Write a protein that holds these residues in place. Structure first.
Motif, PDB file in Angstrom:
ATOM      1  N   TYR A  67     -37.100 -16.257 -40.779  1.00  0.00           N
ATOM      2  CA  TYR A  67     -36.851 -15.409 -41.948  1.00  0.00           C
ATOM      3  C   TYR A  67     -35.401 -14.922 -41.984  1.00  0.00           C
ATOM      4  O   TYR A  67     -34.845 -14.514 -40.964  1.00  0.00           O
ATOM      5  N   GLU A  68     -34.798 -14.967 -43.166  1.00  0.00           N
ATOM      6  CA  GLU A  68     -33.419 -14.531 -43.348  1.00  0.00           C
ATOM      7  C   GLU A  68     -33.287 -13.713 -44.619  1.00  0.00           C
ATOM      8  O   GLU A  68     -34.137 -13.783 -45.509  1.00  0.00           O
ATOM      9  N   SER A  69     -32.217 -12.930 -44.692  1.00  0.00           N
ATOM     10  CA  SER A  69     -31.903 -12.167 -45.890  1.00  0.00           C
ATOM     11  C   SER A  69     -30.499 -12.528 -46.327  1.00  0.00           C
ATOM     12  O   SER A  69     -29.576 -12.599 -45.513  1.00  0.00           O
ATOM     13  N   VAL A  70     -30.349 -12.779 -47.618  1.00  0.00           N
ATOM     14  CA  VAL A  70     -29.064 -13.139 -48.183  1.00  0.00           C
ATOM     15  C   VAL A  70     -28.868 -12.258 -49.406  1.00  0.00           C
ATOM     16  O   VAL A  70     -29.556 -12.429 -50.417  1.00  0.00           O
ATOM     17  N   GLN A  71     -27.931 -11.316 -49.297  1.00  0.00           N
ATOM     18  CA  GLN A  71     -27.883 -10.151 -50.188  1.00  0.00           C
ATOM     19  C   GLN A  71     -29.243  -9.430 -50.048  1.00  0.00           C
ATOM     20  O   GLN A  71     -29.769  -9.322 -48.935  1.00  0.00           O
ATOM     21  N   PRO A  97     -35.080 -12.212 -50.322  1.00  0.00           N
ATOM     22  CA  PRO A  97     -35.774 -12.855 -49.210  1.00  0.00           C
ATOM     23  C   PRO A  97     -35.463 -14.352 -49.182  1.00  0.00           C
ATOM     24  O   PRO A  97     -35.267 -14.958 -50.238  1.00  0.00           O
ATOM     25  N   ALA A  98     -35.406 -14.940 -47.991  1.00  0.00           N
ATOM     26  CA  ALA A  98     -35.073 -16.353 -47.864  1.00  0.00           C
ATOM     27  C   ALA A  98     -35.701 -16.979 -46.630  1.00  0.00           C
ATOM     28  O   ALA A  98     -35.614 -16.428 -45.531  1.00  0.00           O
ATOM     29  N   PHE A  99     -36.330 -18.135 -46.820  1.00  0.00           N
ATOM     30  CA  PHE A  99     -36.796 -18.943 -45.703  1.00  0.00           C
ATOM     31  C   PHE A  99     -35.675 -19.857 -45.213  1.00  0.00           C
ATOM     32  O   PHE A  99     -34.985 -20.499 -46.005  1.00  0.00           O
ATOM     33  N   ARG A 100     -35.512 -19.905 -43.895  1.00  0.00           N
ATOM     34  CA  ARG A 100     -34.512 -20.743 -43.241  1.00  0.00           C
ATOM     35  C   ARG A 100     -35.165 -22.076 -42.876  1.00  0.00           C
ATOM     36  O   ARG A 100     -35.937 -22.159 -41.922  1.00  0.00           O
ATOM     37  N   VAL A 123     -30.664 -24.364 -44.356  1.00  0.00           N
ATOM     38  CA  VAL A 123     -30.632 -23.965 -45.757  1.00  0.00           C
ATOM     39  C   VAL A 123     -31.600 -22.794 -45.978  1.00  0.00           C
ATOM     40  O   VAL A 123     -32.767 -22.860 -45.592  1.00  0.00           O
ATOM     41  N   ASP A 124     -31.081 -21.716 -46.569  1.00  0.00           N
ATOM     42  CA  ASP A 124     -31.821 -20.460 -46.763  1.00  0.00           C
ATOM     43  C   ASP A 124     -32.332 -20.368 -48.187  1.00  0.00           C
ATOM     44  O   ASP A 124     -31.579 -20.030 -49.102  1.00  0.00           O
ATOM     45  N   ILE A 125     -33.616 -20.654 -48.370  1.00  0.00           N
ATOM     46  CA  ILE A 125     -34.181 -20.794 -49.705  1.00  0.00           C
ATOM     47  C   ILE A 125     -34.991 -19.570 -50.100  1.00  0.00           C
ATOM     48  O   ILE A 125     -35.887 -19.151 -49.370  1.00  0.00           O
ATOM     49  N   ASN A 126     -34.669 -19.008 -51.261  1.00  0.00           N
ATOM     50  CA  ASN A 126     -35.482 -17.962 -51.845  1.00  0.00           C
ATOM     51  C   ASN A 126     -36.885 -18.496 -52.064  1.00  0.00           C
ATOM     52  O   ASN A 126     -37.089 -19.323 -52.947  1.00  0.00           O
ATOM     53  N   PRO A 127     -37.864 -18.007 -51.288  1.00  0.00           N
ATOM     54  CA  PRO A 127     -39.187 -18.620 -51.364  1.00  0.00           C
ATOM     55  C   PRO A 127     -39.776 -18.576 -52.775  1.00  0.00           C
ATOM     56  O   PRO A 127     -40.455 -19.514 -53.196  1.00  0.00           O
ATOM     57  N   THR A 131     -38.357 -18.502 -55.973  1.00  0.00           N
ATOM     58  CA  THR A 131     -37.822 -19.322 -57.054  1.00  0.00           C
ATOM     59  C   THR A 131     -37.386 -20.721 -56.606  1.00  0.00           C
ATOM     60  O   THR A 131     -36.925 -21.531 -57.419  1.00  0.00           O
ATOM     61  N   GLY A 132     -37.533 -21.008 -55.316  1.00  0.00           N
ATOM     62  CA  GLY A 132     -37.096 -22.280 -54.762  1.00  0.00           C
ATOM     63  C   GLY A 132     -35.626 -22.521 -55.011  1.00  0.00           C
ATOM     64  O   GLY A 132     -35.206 -23.665 -55.200  1.00  0.00           O
ATOM     65  N   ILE A 133     -34.844 -21.446 -55.025  1.00  0.00           N
ATOM     66  CA  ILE A 133     -33.402 -21.548 -55.223  1.00  0.00           C
ATOM     67  C   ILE A 133     -32.708 -21.338 -53.888  1.00  0.00           C
ATOM     68  O   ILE A 133     -33.144 -20.528 -53.071  1.00  0.00           O
ATOM     69  N   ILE A 134     -31.625 -22.074 -53.675  1.00  0.00           N
ATOM     70  CA  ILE A 134     -30.879 -21.987 -52.432  1.00  0.00           C
ATOM     71  C   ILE A 134     -29.908 -20.820 -52.520  1.00  0.00           C
ATOM     72  O   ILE A 134     -29.284 -20.604 -53.555  1.00  0.00           O
ATOM     73  N   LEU A 135     -29.801 -20.068 -51.431  1.00  0.00           N
ATOM     74  CA  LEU A 135     -28.936 -18.894 -51.362  1.00  0.00           C
ATOM     75  C   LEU A 135     -27.755 -19.125 -50.419  1.00  0.00           C
ATOM     76  O   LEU A 135     -26.622 -18.751 -50.722  1.00  0.00           O
ATOM     77  N   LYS A 136     -28.043 -19.716 -49.265  1.00  0.00           N
ATOM     78  CA  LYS A 136     -27.029 -20.055 -48.281  1.00  0.00           C
ATOM     79  C   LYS A 136     -27.436 -21.355 -47.589  1.00  0.00           C
ATOM     80  O   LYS A 136     -28.624 -21.594 -47.374  1.00  0.00           O
TER      81      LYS A 136
END
Ligand SMILES: *[C@@H]1O[C@H](CO)[C@@H](O[C@@H]2O[C@H](CO)[C@@H](O[C@@H]3O[C@H](CO[C@H]4O[C@H](CO[C@H]5O[C@H](CO)[C@@H](O)[C@H](O)[C@@H]5O[C@@H]5O[C@H](COP(=O)(O)O)[C@@H](O)[C@H](O)[C@@H]5O)[C@@H](O)[C@H](O)[C@@H]4O)[C@@H](O)[C@H](O[C@H]4O[C@H](CO)[C@@H](O)[C@H](O)[C@@H]4O)[C@@H]3O)[C@H](O)[C@H]2NC(C)=O)[C@H](O)[C@H]1NC(C)=O
Ligand SMILES: *[C@@H]1O[C@H](CO)[C@@H](O[C@@H]2O[C@H](CO)[C@@H](O[C@@H]3O[C@H](CO[C@H]4O[C@H](CO)[C@@H](O)[C@H](O[C@H]5O[C@H](CO)[C@@H](O)[C@H](O)[C@@H]5O)[C@@H]4O)[C@@H](O)[C@H](O[C@H]4O[C@H](CO)[C@@H](O)[C@H](O)[C@@H]4O)[C@@H]3O)[C@H](O)[C@H]2NC(C)=O)[C@H](O)[C@H]1NC(C)=O
Ligand SMILES: *[C@@H]1O[C@H](CO)[C@@H](O[C@@H]2O[C@H](CO)[C@@H](O[C@@H]3O[C@H](CO[C@H]4O[C@H](CO)[C@@H](O)[C@H](O)[C@@H]4O)[C@@H](O)[C@H](O[C@H]4O[C@H](CO)[C@@H](O)[C@H](O)[C@@H]4O)[C@@H]3O)[C@H](O)[C@H]2NC(C)=O)[C@H](O)[C@H]1NC(C)=O
Ligand SMILES: *[C@@H]1O[C@H](CO)[C@@H](O[C@@H]2O[C@H](CO)[C@@H](O[C@@H]3O[C@H](CO[C@H]4O[C@H](CO)[C@@H](O)[C@H](O)[C@@H]4O)[C@@H](O)[C@H](O[C@H]4O[C@H](CO)[C@@H](O)[C@H](O)[C@@H]4O)[C@@H]3O)[C@H](O)[C@H]2NC(C)=O)[C@H](O)[C@H]1NC(C)=O
Ligand SMILES: *[C@@H]1O[C@H](CO)[C@@H](O[C@@H]2O[C@H](CO)[C@@H](O[C@@H]3O[C@H](CO)[C@@H](O)[C@H](O)[C@@H]3O)[C@H](O)[C@H]2NC(C)=O)[C@H](O)[C@H]1NC(C)=O
Ligand SMILES: *[C@@H]1O[C@H](CO)[C@@H](O[C@@H]2O[C@H](CO)[C@@H](O)[C@H](O)[C@H]2NC(C)=O)[C@H](O)[C@H]1NC(C)=O
Ligand SMILES: *[C@@H]1O[C@H](CO)[C@@H](O)[C@H](O)[C@H]1NC(C)=O
Ligand SMILES: *[C@@H]1O[C@H](CO)[C@@H](O)[C@H](O)[C@H]1NC(C)=O
Ligand SMILES: [Cl-]
Length: 394
Positions: A248-252, A255-258, A331-335, A337-342
């Motif tokens: 689990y990661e946070s980008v801003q 929430p984001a899955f690594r 790749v850190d994906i916003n679970p 919206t399936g959008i990439i954050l980092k």
């Protein structure tokens, strides 16, 4: 529910897919050869890491055509690179990298595969070539004129006198795609159904290995769950791949899955035996022979510093110090919206090299996978768009 995330003329989902707002960067890192003469006498190569050389990308979709009334969509992903000097270690037009003469190693490989054998052989005999050369970082990337290719070009105009790792890649695409929009199902969003009119590959052994699974890599289907594996077709890698949940990661605030590339992907196993043309005979864990798709050149893909690879690859080349933090692909994906954050899409380019009695140019060189350069294609979301999305989401 979020049927907002579908490609249809009107939604922001489409506009962003069409014209990506977030800046992508590729950083190139080269391996400068410190002991060429000694390598030719069969000694262990020592190399020096050099870089970054940073390029900001421009991306967009062109020749867009909706298909089957809103379910399929054909387009081409153009891509260009703008150099950023103050983000780089030096000027690539001036900076010199000494490394393998890939042009001559390529034509050799062709001669060995009985392609233009005489013509290639006569020229090498006529005009002695060096196995190690020195050129500018700019020449290596975007291309330069080579003697032997020029001599061949005289007789065979189909063959280009110039060579470069990214020759004629600036401001072009990687072929005709037809993507699958979320209309039929949000799961099959920006999914790939064809490439150059073909629904699968044909250079790998198994039907399984020739499959084209996943998205182009630049985005994903919404409502991802940690339990699920995610497939990608990176064209330049010449095969589909999967990535699996790491942590689990946070980008801003988001929430984001690594999701990272697991080591199963390039492992020396029976599953991956179908990637090891001709008779499933693989070089070892952590590398990929892509001669076929790179026009018969002896190109071996791998991760940077042979991370996730057999150790004897690392031992072969002095100066290869791999570590996860610097060299993994993540790749850190916003679970939601399936959008990439980092993301740091990272990989290496190597050359297979061995001694040949017919070709003195090879001297007494050891048999090894020779690292030339790797890169990091990255992206990072800024405040503005982040909180815009974060507020847009609610
Ligand atoms: C990474 O992956 C890549 C690809 O996945 C791997 O490469 C594959 O594997 C190897 C690499 O070495 C290679 O296998 C070899 O292929 C050689 C060539 O195969 C092609 O050509 C065959 C022969 O064609 C010539 O001869 C025929 C008559 O006998 C004739 O029909 C043809 O027209 C042709 O004529 C030639 O013409 C020129 C004249 O032209 P100019 O130059 O213009 O004057 C003459 O100079 C020449 O002498 C000749 O007359 C053909 O039959 C075949 O179908 C292919 O199309 C073969 O030579 C190799 O055979 C070996 O085994 C023989 C057993 O019978 C041995 O006796 C012999 O010693 C020989 O070495 C062998 O099959 C694959 O081709 C290659 N595949 C690709 C796509 O590149 C790579 O190895 C991997 N790397 C790593 C590190 O893992
Ligand atoms: C891949 O492909 C992409 C896309 O094509 C390349 O990106 C583009 O490269 C071109 C060509 O190099 C770039 O044009 C150059 O821009 C530089 C930057 O200088 C800037 O500032 C100047 C102030 O000193 C300014 O004058 C320039 O132009 C602006 O003003 C004019 C009119 O006044 C206006 O029309 C322009 O739109 C600009 O607003 C510029 O912004 C510039 O120095 C270059 O000029 C020299 O070179 C040209 C020949 O190319 C020559 O004719 C001139 O006399 C001069 O010697 C040139 O204009 C362009 O900026 C890039 N585009 C983007 C979006 O970045 C990329 O470089 C390629 N990469 C690789 C690796 O191949
Ligand atoms: C990757 O690794 C390679 C190989 O090690 C490095 O390439 C060498 O780089 C050095 C400099 O870093 C090069 O040396 C430089 O050459 C310049 C041009 O040389 C010719 O012209 C001069 C006249 O200017 C002649 O005298 C000479 O005989 C050559 O024919 C010189 O201008 C430079 O000279 C200056 O060097 C220093 C100050 O910079 C002073 O000591 C000198 O007095 C002089 O002012 C310099 O010598 C060399 O040519 C390259 N070798 C090869 C084989 O290409 C790369 O640097 C390395 N890459 C990176 C990024 O580090
Ligand atoms: C794209 O991919 C590339 C890598 O492939 C990235 O470039 C690397 O970025 C990472 C992350 O910053 C770098 O890692 C850092 O290495 C540095 C090493 O510093 C040297 O010098 C200092 C003295 O100042 C010594 O102390 C040190 O031992 C080294 O000799 C350090 O600056 C960093 O160390 C700090 O952070 C790490 C966190 O991992 C801690 O472990 C340390 O204790 C310390 O706090 C860090 O290790 C790496 O060097 C870069 N490499 C290259 C070749 O540029 C890009 O950043 C990446 N992503 C993007 C988006 O571009
Ligand atoms: C691209 O597509 C598919 C799907 O991701 C990948 O093939 C799949 O591989 C697994 C093995 O890990 C298969 O499991 C199989 O289940 C079937 C049904 O019970 C069974 O017949 C097999 O014995 C095996 O247990 C999975 O089903 C299989 N998919 C299909 C459609 O057969 C493939 O490897 C991917 N390729 C690339 C290059 O990414
Ligand atoms: C790649 O894997 C193959 C098989 O999984 C390995 O080949 C085995 O090698 C051992 C001895 O090292 C033999 O006893 C086995 O019979 C071989 N098996 C098969 C199926 O060939 C091989 O070690 C691996 N390749 C490399 C380069 O490490
Ligand atoms: C979509 O936007 C409008 C729909 O009316 C139209 O003007 C335009 O031509 C279309 N463009 C694309 C790329 O589909
Ligand atoms: C994608 O949409 C659904 C979602 O699972 C799936 O059943 C279907 O097979 C896919 N569509 C196509 C055209 O492959
Ligand atoms: Cl952050």
């Amino acid at each position: 529910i979020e049927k907002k995330i579908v490609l249809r003329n009107g939604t922001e989902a489409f506009d962003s897919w069409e014209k990506p707002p977030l800046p992508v960067y590729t950083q190139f890192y080269f391996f400068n050869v410190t002991n060429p003469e000694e390598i030719l006498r069969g000694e262990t190569p020592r190399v020096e890491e050099v870089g970054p050389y940073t390029y900001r990308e421009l991306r967009n979709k062109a020749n867009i055509q909706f298909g089957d009334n809103g379910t399929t969509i054909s387009a081409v992903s153009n891509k260009a690179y703008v150099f950023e000097r103050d983000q780089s270690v030096g000027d690539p037009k001036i900076d010199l990298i000494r490394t393998l003469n890939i042009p001559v190693l390529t034509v050799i490989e062709w001669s060995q595969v009985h392609f233009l054998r005489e013509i290639i052989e006569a020229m090498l005999k006529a005009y002695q070539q060096k196995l190690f050369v020195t050129h500018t970082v700019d020449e290596l990337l975007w291309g330069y004129k080579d003697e032997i290719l020029s001599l061949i070009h005289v007789f065979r105009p189909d063959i280009s006198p110039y060579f470069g790792l990214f020759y004629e890649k600036n401001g072009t695409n990687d072929g005709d795609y037809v993507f699958l929009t979320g209309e039929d199902s949000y799961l099959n969003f920006t999914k790939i159904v064809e490439w150059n009119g073909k629904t699968s590959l044909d250079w790998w052994i198994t039907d399984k290995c020739n499959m084209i699974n996943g998205t182009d890599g630049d985005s994903f289907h919404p409502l991802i769950t940690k339990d699920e594996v995610l497939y990608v077709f990176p064209s330049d890698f010449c095969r589909s791949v999967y990535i699996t949940f790491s942590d689990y990661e946070s980008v801003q605030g988001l929430p984001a899955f690594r999701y990272k590339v697991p080591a199963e992907i390039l492992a020396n196993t029976s599953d991956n035996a179908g990637f090891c043309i001709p008779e499933g005979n693989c070089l070892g864990s952590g590398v990929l022979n892509v001669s076929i798709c790179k026009n018969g050149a002896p190109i071996i893909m791998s991760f940077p510093h042979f991370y996730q690879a057999d150790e004897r690859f690392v031992s072969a080349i002095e100066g290869m110090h791999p570590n996860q933090e610097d060299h993994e692909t993540f790749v850190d994906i916003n679970p939601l919206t399936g959008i990439i954050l980092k993301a740091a899409k990272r990989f290496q380019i190597n050359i297979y090299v061995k001694k040949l009695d017919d070709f003195v140019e090879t001297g007494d060189i050891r048999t090894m996978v020779f690292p030339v350069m790797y890169l990091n294609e990255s992206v990072h979301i800024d405040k503005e768009t982040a909180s815009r999305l974060k507020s847009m989401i609610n």
